[PDB]
C-alpha cells in the first residue's frame, strides 16, 4: 500500500543524501594538515585538588569568570568552588540525591541540576536572606535528565532519556519548545557560542543540529557505532566533536555536513565520558573510562599528552572561558585543575 | 599569612561547610540502602503496602535501623545508563510471584512470565556493577500457588521437571532454579523468603538478611573473611 512506497522513498532520499555528501568530499583533513608543525609535548601539572565530595562526581560546569565552579555528586549536594583558593562558597542540599547533570548560569545568578527524578531544579544563588533556595522545579520529562544548559536567566535547554529535548521558560515553568526526532536516550547537549543553535547526542549513535526558536532539525550526523556520551562545539561554532563507547572521538563539520577527523588508538578500548575543546580549538581533551584523560591534536589526530592522576573513571571535563585551566572530575570524589 | 580579613572569613566559612559535609557523611553512611526490582506487577504493590514520576524512595525505621528503598518502576529507559548509580547499595530486593507460571505476558506467546522473571534476574544478578552485592529474593502469592497447583502441573513451565505436583517440592524446584542462575557464587549470597504472610515477618527477614550482609562486609574489611 503506502507503507512500502514511503519506505522506498525514504531509502531513495537517504541514498541521494549519501551521494551528495560523497560528491562534496575532495580532500581529507589529514591531506591539508600534514604540512603544519606538530603540536609537540603537552605536560599539564595538577595545580588544585578540590576535596569534600563523599561519592561519585557526575557533573561539573565552569563559570563565566573562570574562577567559580559547580560540581554535583551522589551525596545529594551541590558545591560551588573558588578554584583560585580551593574555598567552598555554597553547599546546596538536593531533594533527590540521584543527580546526573548541573549547569551554571552565564550571569552567575542561578545553578541548575537534574537526574533520575525527572525534574530540573533551578537554584537562586543571590538571595536577600543569604541562603540558596529552590527557585523553580521544571517537570514534564518522562525520562531521566542527562544534560541542561542555560541560555539566559529565563531560558534553559534540557535533554532527557525519553528521546526528547526541551526549551523551558523559567518564569512560567512551561515547556516552550519540544525537540523530537531521536530514537534513543539523549545523553549530551552543547550550545553554540551565538545562542542560536545547539546539537545533541543520543544512544542511537547519531547527533542532530537544532534551532532554539524554530524547533526543527537541520542536519543529522552519523558514523559512531555506539552510544554518544558527550558533545562539544568548536570555538567558532562551525564544528563539533563527539565521544562514544567505541573508544573513538569524531569531528563533524556543519557547513560540509560530513565527518572530518577520527581520534582513536589501538591501545584504547574504553569508552569516552567527556569531551572539551581548547580556546583556539587546536587541542581536544577527552575523558575516558581507563581513569585518565588524553589530549588530542584536533588537526593532526595525534596524541599530544595524557592527564593521569585519577583513581577511578573520569566523568566530566571543562575548560575555562579564557582557557587558562582544565578541570577534571572523577568517580573517586575529587576535582583537579591542570595547567 | 598573606590573607585579608575577608579572605580569612571566607576560609572559616569554607571550614564550616566542610564540617557540615563531614557530619552528614556519617548519617549517609549509617543508612541501609536497598534497590527494589521486579518484573511487571508481581509483588510491587504488596511490599510497599506492608509499610503501613521517576524514582520512588521509601523511608522507614525498624529496630534502630534506617532503611532506604529505591523503586525503579516507571523508569522506561535504557538500564545500562543509570544502573551504575546503585553500585554501593547494601542489598537488592527481588520480587517474583509464584502464580505466574501458567500465565503469558499477552504480547509474546513464547515468552513465559516466569521465564521473563528469570531472564531479568540473570541480567541483574550477574551485572558487572553488582559482583559483591547480595540479593534478597521474595516469592509472593504462595496461597495462589496452593490453589492453582492442584489443577495445573508445573510441567507447563519446566518440561524437564520430574517431580510430584505438590506445593513443597514445586516451591523447592522454583527456588533452586532461581538460585542456579547465580554464577558469582564465590562472592555473593542469595537469600530466599516466602512472603505470602499477612504477619509482619517480611520486615524481620529483611532485617536479618541485612544484618548478615553487614556482618560479612565488616569481616571482609577486617580480613578475617
Amino acid at each position, epitope marked *: 500500500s503506502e507503507l512500502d512506497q514511503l519506505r522506498q522513498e525514504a531509502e531513495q532520499l537517504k541514498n541521494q543524501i549519501r551521494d551528495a555528501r560523497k560528491a562534496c568530499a575532495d580532500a581529507t583533513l589529514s591531506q591539508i594538515t600534514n604540512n603544519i608543525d606538530p603540536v609537540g609535548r603537552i605536560q599539564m601539572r595538577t595545580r588544585r585538588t578540590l576535596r569534600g565530595h563523599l561519592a561519585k562526581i557526575y557533573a561539573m560546569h565552569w563559570g563565566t569568570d573562570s574562577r567559580l565552579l559547580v560540581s554535583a555528586s551522589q551525596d545529594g549536594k551541590l558545591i560551588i568552588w573558588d578554584s583560585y583558593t580551593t*574555598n567552598k562558597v555554597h553547599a546546596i542540599p538536593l531533594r533527590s540525591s540521584w543527580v546526573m547533570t548541573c549547569a551554571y548560569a552565564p550571569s552567575g545568578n542561578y545553578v541548575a541540576c537534574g537526574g533520575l527524578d525527572n525534574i530540573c531544579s533551578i537554584y537562586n544563588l543571590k538571595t*536577600r*536572606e*543569604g541562603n540558596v533556595r529552590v527557585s523553580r522545579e521544571l517537570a514534564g520529562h518522562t525520562g531521566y535528565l542527562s544534560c541542561c544548559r542555560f541560555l539566559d536567566d529565563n531560558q534553559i535547554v534540557t535533554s532527557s532519556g525519553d528521546t526528547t529535548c526541551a526549551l523551558w521558560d523559567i518564569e512560567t515553568g512551561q515547556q516552550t519548545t519540544t525537540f523530537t526526532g531521536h530514537t534513543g536516550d539523549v545523553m549530551s547537549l552543547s550550545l553554540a557560542p551565538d545562542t542560536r543553535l545547539f546539537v545533541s547526542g543520543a544512544c542511537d549513535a547519531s547527533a542532530k543540529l537544532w534551532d532554539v526558536r524554530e524547533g526543527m532539525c537541520r542536519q543529522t550526523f552519523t558514523g559512531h557505532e555506539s552510544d554518544i556520551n558527550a558533545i562539544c562545539f568548536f570555538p567558532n561554532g562551525n564544528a563539533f566533536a563527539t565521544g562514544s563507547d567505541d573508544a573513538t572521538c569524531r569531528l563533524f563539520d556543519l557547513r560540509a555536513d560530513q565527518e572530518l577527523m577520527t581520534y582513536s588508538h589501538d591501545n584504547i578500548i574504553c569508552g569516552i565520558t567527556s569531551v572539551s575543546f581548547s580556546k583556539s580549538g587546536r587541542l581536544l581533551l577527552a575523558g575516558y573510562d581507563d581513569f585518565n584523560c588524553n589530549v588530542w591534536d584536533a588537526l593532526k589526530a595525534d596524541r599530544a599528552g595524557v592527564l593521569a592522576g585519577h583513581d577511578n573513571r573520569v566523568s566530566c571535563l571543562g575548560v575555562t572561558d579564557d582557557g587558562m585551566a582544565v578541570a577534571t572530575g572523577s568517580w573517586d570524589s575529587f576535582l583537579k585543575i591542570w595547567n | 599569612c598573606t590573607l585579608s*580579613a575577608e579572605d580569612k572569613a571566607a576560609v*572559616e*566559612r569554607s571550614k564550616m561547610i566542610d564540617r557540615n559535609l563531614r557530619e552528614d557523611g556519617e548519617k549517609a553512611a549509617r543508612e541501609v540502602k536497598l534497590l527494589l526490582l521486579g518484573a511487571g506487577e508481581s509483588g510491587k504493590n504488596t511490599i510497599v503496602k506492608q509499610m503501613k514520576t521517576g524514582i520512588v524512595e521509601t523511608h522507614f525505621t525498624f529496630k534502630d535501623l534506617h532503611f532506604k528503598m529505591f523503586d525503579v518502576g516507571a523508569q522506561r529507559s535504557e538500564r545500562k545508563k543509570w544502573i551504575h548509580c546503585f553500585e554501593g547499595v547494601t542489598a537488592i530486593i527481588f520480587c517474583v510471584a509464584l502464580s505466574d507460571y501458567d500465565l503469558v505476558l499477552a504480547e509474546d506467546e513464547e515468552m513465559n512470565r516466569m521465564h521473563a522473571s528469570m531472564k531479568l534476574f540473570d541480567s541483574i544478578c550477574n551485572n558487572k556493577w553488582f559482583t559483591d552485592t547480595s540479593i534478597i529474593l521474595f516469592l509472593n502469592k504462595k496461597d495462589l500457588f496452593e490453589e492453582k497447583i492442584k489443577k495445573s502441573p508445573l510441567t507447563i513451565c519446566y518440561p524437564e521437571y520430574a517431580g510430584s505436583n505438590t506445593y513443597e517440592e514445586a516451591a523447592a524446584y522454583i527456588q533452586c532454579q532461581f538460585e542456579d542462575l547465580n554464577k558469582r557464587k564465590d562472592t555473593k549470597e542469595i537469600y530466599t523468603h516466602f512472603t505470602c504472610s499477612t504477619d509482619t515477618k517480611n520486615v524481620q527477614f529483611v532485617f536479618d538478611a541485612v544484618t548478615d550482609v553487614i556482618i560479612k562486609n565488616n569481616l571482609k574489611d577486617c580480613g578475617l573473611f
Partner: single-chain antibody
Amino acid sequence: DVQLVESGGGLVQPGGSRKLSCSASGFAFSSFGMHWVRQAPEKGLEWVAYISSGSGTIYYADTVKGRFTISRDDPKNTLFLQMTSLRSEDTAMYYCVRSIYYYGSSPFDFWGQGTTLTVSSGSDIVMTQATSSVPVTPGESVSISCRSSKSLLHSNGNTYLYWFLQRPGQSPQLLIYRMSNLASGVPDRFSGSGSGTAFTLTISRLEAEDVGVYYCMQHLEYPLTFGAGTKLEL
C-alpha cells in the same frame, strides 16, 4: 522582610551594666557575621565589636577590650552585647550590622534601626574626608573624596573600601562595597572610582533623596575605621 530590631537602651549611671539585644527576623542568622557600630551625638560612626558565623572569631575595638562582651544565640536569632563599667564616652546610638563573607559577597549590607544609651555625667589606619560640607544645587554632579594613610590595594587585586549614606533620621545604608561595585537596591547614578590611597565617589544627576552624610570605611585589617563624614546640604 529583613529586620534587625534593637533593645536595651535608656539612661545609665556611670559604672553600671546594661545588655543590648539585637533581634533578627527574615534571614538566616546563623550564616551571617554580626557587627556592633555606634554613633555619638557628634555625628561620627565608630566600630565596636564583631562576632563571626559559628562564634569562632571575635574582635573588639581598642576602647572596649575588657569591658564589652559580644555573644549570639543562633536558635533564638538574637545578638547580645554585654556592656560593663560604662563611662560617659559610651553615650552613642548602637547599631547592629549584618555581614557575610565569601567570594563576591556584599558585606555590611543591612543595618538595624539602632538603640540609644545615655550615660549621665597607633598602627590603626586613618581615613580622612577633607570636605565636611558641600552645598550644591540638585541635578549636578558631586564628587566626594576620602584618602587613606595606608594603601588598601591588597596583593590579591581587591581594594577594600566601602561607602555609606545616612539620610537624616535614618540608618546608614551601603552604596559601594569594594571601590567599584554598586550595592543592591541603590540607583546606578552612584559611581565609585579610585586607586591606591585616593578614592572618589561621583553622584551624577543628584536628587533630593540623596541628601545626607556620606561615610568611607575600610575592611583591610581590624579594627575597621570610618571617616569624619561629608554632609551634602540644600
